[PDB]
Design an enzyme around this catalytic site. Sequence first.
Site, PDB file in Angstrom:
ATOM      1  N   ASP A 185      53.863  29.983  83.296  1.00 32.72           N
ATOM      2  CA  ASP A 185      55.224  29.482  83.419  1.00 32.72           C
ATOM      3  C   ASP A 185      55.388  28.698  84.708  1.00 32.72           C
ATOM      4  O   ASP A 185      55.593  27.483  84.685  1.00 32.72           O
ATOM      5  CB  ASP A 185      56.230  30.630  83.396  1.00 32.72           C
ATOM      6  CG  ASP A 185      56.203  31.401  82.103  1.00 32.72           C
ATOM      7  OD1 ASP A 185      55.774  30.832  81.084  1.00 32.72           O
ATOM      8  OD2 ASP A 185      56.620  32.577  82.100  1.00 32.72           O
ATOM      9  N   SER A 234      59.135  26.551  88.393  1.00 33.16           N
ATOM     10  CA  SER A 234      59.301  27.943  87.980  1.00 33.16           C
ATOM     11  C   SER A 234      60.182  27.956  86.740  1.00 33.16           C
ATOM     12  O   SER A 234      61.402  27.801  86.841  1.00 33.16           O
ATOM     13  CB  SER A 234      59.911  28.791  89.089  1.00 33.16           C
ATOM     14  OG  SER A 234      59.643  30.164  88.875  1.00 33.16           O
ATOM     15  N   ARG A 235      59.568  28.164  85.577  1.00 33.61           N
ATOM     16  CA  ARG A 235      60.235  27.956  84.300  1.00 33.61           C
ATOM     17  C   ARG A 235      61.127  29.109  83.866  1.00 33.61           C
ATOM     18  O   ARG A 235      61.676  29.055  82.761  1.00 33.61           O
ATOM     19  CB  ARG A 235      59.204  27.660  83.212  1.00 33.61           C
ATOM     20  CG  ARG A 235      58.466  26.363  83.470  1.00 33.61           C
ATOM     21  CD  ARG A 235      57.455  26.047  82.395  1.00 33.61           C
ATOM     22  NE  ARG A 235      56.231  25.511  82.979  1.00 33.61           N
ATOM     23  CZ  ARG A 235      55.288  24.881  82.290  1.00 33.61           C
ATOM     24  NH1 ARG A 235      55.436  24.699  80.985  1.00 33.61           N
ATOM     25  NH2 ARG A 235      54.204  24.427  82.904  1.00 33.61           N
ATOM     26  N   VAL A 236      61.281  30.152  84.679  1.00 32.74           N
ATOM     27  CA  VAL A 236      62.442  31.011  84.481  1.00 32.74           C
ATOM     28  C   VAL A 236      63.660  30.423  85.186  1.00 32.74           C
ATOM     29  O   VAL A 236      64.792  30.614  84.729  1.00 32.74           O
ATOM     30  CB  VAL A 236      62.160  32.463  84.915  1.00 32.74           C
ATOM     31  CG1 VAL A 236      61.015  33.034  84.108  1.00 32.74           C
ATOM     32  CG2 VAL A 236      61.828  32.548  86.391  1.00 32.74           C
TER      33      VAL A 236
END
Lengths: 520, 242, 52, 122, 21, 193
Positions: free
Chosen positions: A361, A386-388
């Site tokens: 991610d 940061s794909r959150v």
Amino acid sequence: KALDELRKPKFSSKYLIQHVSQKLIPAVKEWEKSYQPPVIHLGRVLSVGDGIARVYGLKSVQAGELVCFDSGVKGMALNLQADHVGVVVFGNDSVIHQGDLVYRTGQIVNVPIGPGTLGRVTDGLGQPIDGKGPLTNVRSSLVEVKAPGIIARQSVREPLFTGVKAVDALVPIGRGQRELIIGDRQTGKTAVAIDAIIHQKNCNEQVPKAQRVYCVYVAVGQKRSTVAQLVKLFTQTGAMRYTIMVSATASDAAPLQFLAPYSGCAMAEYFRDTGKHGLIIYDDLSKQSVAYRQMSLLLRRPPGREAFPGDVFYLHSRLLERAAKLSKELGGGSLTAFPVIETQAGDVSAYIATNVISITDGQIFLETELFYKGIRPALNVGLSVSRVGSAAQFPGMKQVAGTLKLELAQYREVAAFAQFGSDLDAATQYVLERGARLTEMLKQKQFAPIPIERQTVAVYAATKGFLDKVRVQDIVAAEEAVISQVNPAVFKILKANGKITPALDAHLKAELRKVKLPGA
Amino acid sequence: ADAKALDELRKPKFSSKYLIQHVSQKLIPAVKEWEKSYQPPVIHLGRVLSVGDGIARVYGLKSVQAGELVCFDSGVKGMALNLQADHVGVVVFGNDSVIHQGDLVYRTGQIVNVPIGPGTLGRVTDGLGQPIDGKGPLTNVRSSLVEVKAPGIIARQSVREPLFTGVKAVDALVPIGRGQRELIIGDRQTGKTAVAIDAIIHQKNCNEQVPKAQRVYCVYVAVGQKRSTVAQLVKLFTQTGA
Amino acid sequence: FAGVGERTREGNDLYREMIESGVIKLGAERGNSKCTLVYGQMNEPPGARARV
Amino acid sequence: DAGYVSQVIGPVVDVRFDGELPSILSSLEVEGHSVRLVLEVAQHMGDNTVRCIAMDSTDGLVRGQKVVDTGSPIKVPVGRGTLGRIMNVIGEPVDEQGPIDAADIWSIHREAPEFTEQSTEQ
Amino acid sequence: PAIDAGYVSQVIGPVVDVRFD
Amino acid sequence: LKLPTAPLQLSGTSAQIATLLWQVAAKENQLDKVQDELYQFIELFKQHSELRRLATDPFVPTLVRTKIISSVLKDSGASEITKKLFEALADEGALSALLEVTVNYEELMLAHKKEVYCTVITAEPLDKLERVELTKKAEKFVDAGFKLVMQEKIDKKLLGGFVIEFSDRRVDMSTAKKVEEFNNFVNKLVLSI
Ligand SMILES: Nc1ncnc2c1ncn2[C@@H]1O[C@H](COP(=O)(O)OP(=O)(O)OP(=O)(O)O)[C@@H](O)[C@H]1O
Ligand SMILES: Nc1ncnc2c1ncn2[C@@H]1O[C@H](COP(=O)(O)OP(=O)(O)OP(=O)(O)O)[C@@H](O)[C@H]1O
Ligand SMILES: [Mg+2]
Ligand SMILES: [Mg+2]
């Protein structure tokens, strides 16, 4: 001539003499009385070499089944060919001869997992090497397991606090995602992972038992003295009671280095399957891909780009997909993976680097140019994703993180214009100095993790100009002065309430006015 | 092992006959009792020894020409590209799934033919010449080789007469003769098919103004594009009249 | 939705997002659903990722 | 009728049938495995042996394990019964809501339609 | 000394093969 | 478990079958029986087509080939060694390796029968004092106590003398090469002296 068709032989096999000798040596009349070696559950070594043994026999062996040589060393049956079995060796292949017996064990590869694994410096196979005895409070689970499905997961909500100011604000990490630390050699990758471990020691004595984080560090291909120094360091901080040290070093055999992150993931999945939280750092995953490359190239598999096999994407895929945030029906546990991929002089367009970047991610790109600018940790804030995002960012830090990202975004494009000293603009100079304030704010010494509330206060004091009066060269100590000279109540309620409330942002707005900055 | 110690077994050297006399009467009922589990032996025919990824290696085929259209018993055709010492490696024109290990391959005696002539003018054929527009089979047409020899040095004259493309930059900067191999190179989505189709439409427009010998008949070869792009080009040429 | 070879996490996020938005309906109102998810995510060996 | 596994290398399994081989792209079921493993025939090797690619992991395959042919490609449950369900690659429900209703059961391998049956409507 | 006295089988540069009984 | 050592080492994967065959038939002391049986099978492959179809055709199933080689070799006093050999070589389709397993077996037996061949090629038919004087000069080229046989060939290109063909070394004691090395020795001195 009618004899020319049978002139040259057309063999469908290589070990033809090994099949003929299982039928001609009983044709001797004196050798019918149990003068035959069985190959139903046994196996004879045909050819040893380079940590690869090819075993004739083993008719009932399974693919990936751990077999044992009669010399004592174990091995994994990997290639199940039509006439033999290509068996890798988990140790030195000097102890193996042609004609030795291979006794299969019926077991796919097993490692001892459990609560007794905490603090145990073990290999990628399960033997502890720290000299504190065997593993006592453990159970033997599988190494290669199926990753959790789509039902078995839930959304990544709770944050995993790292303690590093360059990553907890900009590249936030939730409890259950896979965050890659990619860089060059001696750029700060292992140090960022160690700070992420030591902050769990600083954090776990303040949270209840269901919120504790048990680290697992997987040293693949490192030195033995590096893991000795890291065990000495984790014992000097006392964080060994939360840390498992899985260590297949550079002296150890190539299938041990290949199976070390899988063994560590099985040892860390116990906390994920039992409602606890886990944190795993597959350190030097590129060396694990190198060990798999060697183990496959000695097993006669056709190589691809950079002589890697085809399934080396699958090798890291099926390892990293076991890191997830499970749902409440399956315990609510979590495992946060931290792969470490070393690039060579910044070629991020390599094979293993692009594969692990395509899997994970987030990514933390540490650059060797900004490491020597004094910016330590060397986080390139532009390439790090940061794909959150803000779904698992700490509240309070979310109030200033957008400002931090935008101001550093303008400071990244104000470059290639600061080399003309008379060219004042008085607006690009303001963002140009603000970017220097924020950049030199985010520095940290190593092995010094800061709690998240002090990080939020320290970056609040810099994004709002309460350290804007000082010079660019004295912000490394003015940060500590701001942390020390405020009331201890501000961190004490900011850690507890969860966000910077309107009933606090007037207190520490004034507490930064009773501070002494070493510059005016 | 050598050949010198292997040629000398062509002369009989048994000096006893207690094996070759008795089993010579036993072998024929022994191969008679397994007549069902055989396949009829292929000498001038061809049996598929293996098949994979659109490539079938055909045992047999003793008299194929290198490049001859072989036809499988599944109805799919092939083309014997490489001829090995024991087997023939043919390619598969279409679905390879209808070819199993053990099929029969019949050679046709044809170096690969396509229907050429006046009757195919206006037709959409596939890469083998069979029409895919579907208005009946080709009429007033004849087969010819796909791999004819290029004409030589005496058989060519100098490129003089110009091919107007209808594009201003092509006719102004890089002018095309009427015997000129000219490459249209570039990146993806830059207008190479645009220059191609503009040239084709201009030869349509000029063909209704020149007297019957300067009429140039275009041919479009779509390799590896979509079926929808070729259908769009067919609708475009039909609504123009090309 | 034929999710081919992506992460499992975003597949679970899509499934929960279409649960809550009203596209995928569970229980007895399943007949009013207007999306079939097909998932061949990264965990599976490449035959499954090649045929999903 | 049924064949056995001859060679396991990676995710690729060489299955040896004695008589009447399955076609290419045909779906093969390994019997005796723990998790339901499905093989798809990629090519014919040449000595009454096909070479399959495995849909699930080959950890736990024995040389000689009986593999039965299904005479068709990978058949999935298709139709109105699949809406809101998460199907597998071999057509299995992985959303843990029970089995799939079957309007029809279709094989996943098929042809491109035609040149004639197209729509040039932008 | 028939056993434990092998003979050189083949030589490819600096790589020598010994075959034993 | 206890196999007698072969007299000369050999190559791989077709000579190894001959090494094992010589070892097993030397344990059973049938070393010239199985050579006759292999010769009979070579000529048996030469005779009929339905047997060489079991070794050149790749579409014969292995079941019918194994059952044909068993049901043919059930009888006629065949050795257990040759029967189990042909069973193991027909189970794996290695019947085409017969022609080059028997040659390595013949080399092994020729090493054991302690008999080495030669071939003397001459211009005239040899007389009996030419022959018994030839054996004393040709025995000085063998290297132990052997049974060097002397074959005879006649070729008119030699102007007398003899050339020994040992199949691995050649002794050209002929006069046609003596005058050929004579005319080469003169012309290297006329250009110099
Ligand atoms: N916050 C920091 N402040 C000062 N120095 C640091 C900081 N973080 C890391 N360093 C220094 O940078 C170096 C980082 O080395 P690191 O542990 O990253 O090795 P690596 O890059 O993981 O692997 P390799 O040894 O193969 O290069 C350490 O020597 C450490 O002294
Ligand atoms: N001279 C032009 N004027 C205006 N538009 C043009 C011109 N030439 C091309 N185009 C437009 O550019 C687009 C791409 O053209 P075209 O399809 O020829 O590119 P291409 O090189 O064939 O791409 P590809 O090879 O990927 O199919 C078309 O939609 C076309 O309408
Ligand atoms: Mg390091
Ligand atoms: Mg185009």
